[PDB]
Amino acid sequence: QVQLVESGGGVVQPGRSLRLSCAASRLTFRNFGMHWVRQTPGKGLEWVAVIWHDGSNKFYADSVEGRFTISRDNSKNTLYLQMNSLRDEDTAIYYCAKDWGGASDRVFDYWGRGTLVIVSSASTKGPSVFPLAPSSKSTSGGTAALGCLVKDYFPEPVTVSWNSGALTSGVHTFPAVLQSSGLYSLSSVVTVPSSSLGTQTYICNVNHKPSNTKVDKKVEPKSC
Amino acid sequence: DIQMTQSPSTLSASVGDRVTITCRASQSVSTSLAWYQQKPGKAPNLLIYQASTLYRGVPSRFSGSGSGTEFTLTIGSLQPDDFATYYCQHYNSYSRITFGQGTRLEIKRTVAAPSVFIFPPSDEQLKSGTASVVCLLNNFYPREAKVQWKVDNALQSGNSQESVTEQDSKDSTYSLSSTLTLSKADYEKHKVYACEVTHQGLSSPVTKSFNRGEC
Amino acid sequence: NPNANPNA
Amino acid sequence: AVTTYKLVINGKTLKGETTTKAVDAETAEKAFKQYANDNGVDGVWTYDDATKTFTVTE
């Protein structure tokens, strides 16, 4: 079972450098061309570079030529991507992709799990956690909505649960958005019986591991 | 670079349906064209190459056709496992590889109008100097919806961001949040805050609103 | 040809 | 030069902990007061030097 495992991703300021590696297992690595393919926040896929079986030839996307270098060590069954002069447009999941081996088709049969590269000048910062308080304005018939706004953190991810994991039905935790700040924000909401608001306590549990932040916010109803 | 364009961006279907998605290139790629399937959190999986050749282990219900600048992927009788995103990719000689932007195959269900909820900014955040107003559209179908913010009945645009969930595993609906962000100073200059929602399941637009300070 | 056969 | 400080938040509706790295307690407290301010927390500040831990209590 061919396995490809990438490493080296992280958060870096623009203009800095980063080296990705991909270790191949259960594969006669030296027989195959290898590629890097990245996937952007918008879920677009972009081919990055290819390297010949023996390293004797390489080609690059226009976007990265002159800044990225693809290389391989066939003695260690490892592929590398040296990324210099990084740009914010380089933020993506980076996958090593094996060339499937047919001479006439540049298609990828095996992919790694990917390694995440974030290019930003933002500094690590824990979230502000604000209540989305239930009221008549968030009541629809017999259903009420409430939530937590988890704002102005960096980098991704944050994890959110409700009532320490006892509340899962009706929960929607939204994909984060990137603000003009360079910081992220998301909301987590839940719908519950309107008649529960006076008896059940609702607490959102927020965990931001990059900043070692672990906080719980009790979401209290409003009178209006 | 050659530009690959897929149509439609989203396609709705039911198990057992036959569906066809289209990939168009900005110049001829002969038949140097492949299709991939991708599901959330996984890398893509190869389906078809050289436009019409099925890759090892891919079910027979997948087929591909086309040449030059126009290609199609067809799934003859959809199975649950087929709901996913599909990408095309060229590898035309002397042209660097590019991909299409993806077509998402989603599950069709009956129309469901959203429940609409609005949340005023919290006193906690107001203390910090900002005001975020959140409008929630919950468990609706189809995904397309219009959310319009109004402040003192004046249409507001360019000051909000939206987020949408993946199609729900259990009921096949979507949920959507719209967040209006203002400085406290701008916020304090107005009274009535409303979000107006237009959706196929609603006979007329639904508006939820509040008066600043009422809560 | 950037898409020439890269394999052994 | 830099060491890790902790903040325990004991608010009416917000409770938990976070950390920061700083050269001294005064600098850590400035970061922590900003964080508490950003969460709407206004409280009484105490400090335990043995554990390099601030607490803000509402």
Numbering used by the authors:
A (entry chain H): 1 to 52, 52A, 53 to 82, 82A, 82B, 82C, 83 to 100, 100A, ...
B (entry chain L): 1 to 95, 95A, 96 to 214
C (entry chain P): 2 to 9
D (entry chain G): 4 to 61
What wording appears in the published article?
The vaccine is based on PfCSP, which densely covers the surface of sporozoites and plays a critical role in the P. falciparum life cycle from the development of sporozoites in the mosquito midgut to liver-stage development in humans. The repeat region in P. falciparum is composed of 1 NPDP, 3-5 NVDP, and 35-41 NANP repeats. In this work, we characterize eight monoclonal antibodies (mAb) derived from protected volunteers who participated in a phase 2a clinical trial of RTS,S/AS0131 with a delayed fractional dosing regimen, and compare them with three previously published mAbs derived from the same clinical trial. Co-crystal structures also reveal conserved and convergent use of aromatic residues for interaction with the NANP repeat region.
Notably, the main chain of residues in CDR H1 form a conserved hydrogen bonding network with the NANP peptide. Conservation of van der Waals interactions are mediated by aromatic residues 32/33 in CDR H1, and 52 and 58 in CDR H2. While Tyr in position 32/33 and 58 can evolve to other aromatic residues, HTrp52 is strictly conserved in our antibody panel. Two of these residues, 52 and 58, interact specifically with Pro in the Asn pseudo 310 turn and type I β-turn respectively. For 100 µg mAbs, only mAb239, 356 and 364 from the first panel, and mAb224, 399, 366, and 317 from the second-panel exhibit protection that was significantly greater than the naïve control mice (p < 0.05, log-rank test).
